[PDB]
Ligand binder design. Structure first.
Ligand SMILES: Cc1cn([C@H]2C[C@H](OP(=O)(O)O)[C@@H](COP(=O)(O)O)O2)c(=O)[nH]c1=O
Ligand SMILES: [Ca+2]
Length: 129
């Protein structure tokens, strides 16, 4: 997989962010994760965690997987990095997202994500408390 440049337009919620990619505004939905909705338990904390990660980043990067790059809503599907740290994995490691929506061919980082969930679970963090 390859990391590509993007710039933050605005945080949206725990698992979607608006970025400018190849000069076009796009909503990205993070691969392999599911955060609670803002109205749900840990939803505000998830939104906060992602917002802080992307707003504080000097460099945001988009990494597409091998499969579908847009979902049925027109959202980009990618792993998003903030100064080299994957947001998708970070949310899971903190117990603020579950591994989810794992579809064959867009699952390169599935094992990394599941390993993070296991650790978050063993720690009883947030969703796992
Ligand atoms: C993460 C992801 C979501 N989706 C679609 C599946 C779900 O369809 P449905 O809307 O019919 O439930 C929706 C959930 O996204 P959200 O968790 O943002 O609601 O996004 C993909 O198709 N591929 C993906 O990789
Ligand atoms: Ca969600």
């Amino acid at each position: 997989l390859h990391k590509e440049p993007a710039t933050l337009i605005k945080a949206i919620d725990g698992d979607t962010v608006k970025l400018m990619y190849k000069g076009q505004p796009m909503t990205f939905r993070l691969l392999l994760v599911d955060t609670p909705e803002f109205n749900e338990k840990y939803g505000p904390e998830a939104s906060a965690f992602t917002k802080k990660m992307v707003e504080n980043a000097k460099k945001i990067e988009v990494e597409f997987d091998k499969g579908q790059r847009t979902d049925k809503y027109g959202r980009g599907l990618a792993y998003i990095y903030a100064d080299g740290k994957m947001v998708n994995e970070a949310l899971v490691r903190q117990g603020l997202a579950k591994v989810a929506y794992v579809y064959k061919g867009n699952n390169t980082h599935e094992q990394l994500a599941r390993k993070a969930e296991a650790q978050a679970k063993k720690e009883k963090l947030n969703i796992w408390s």
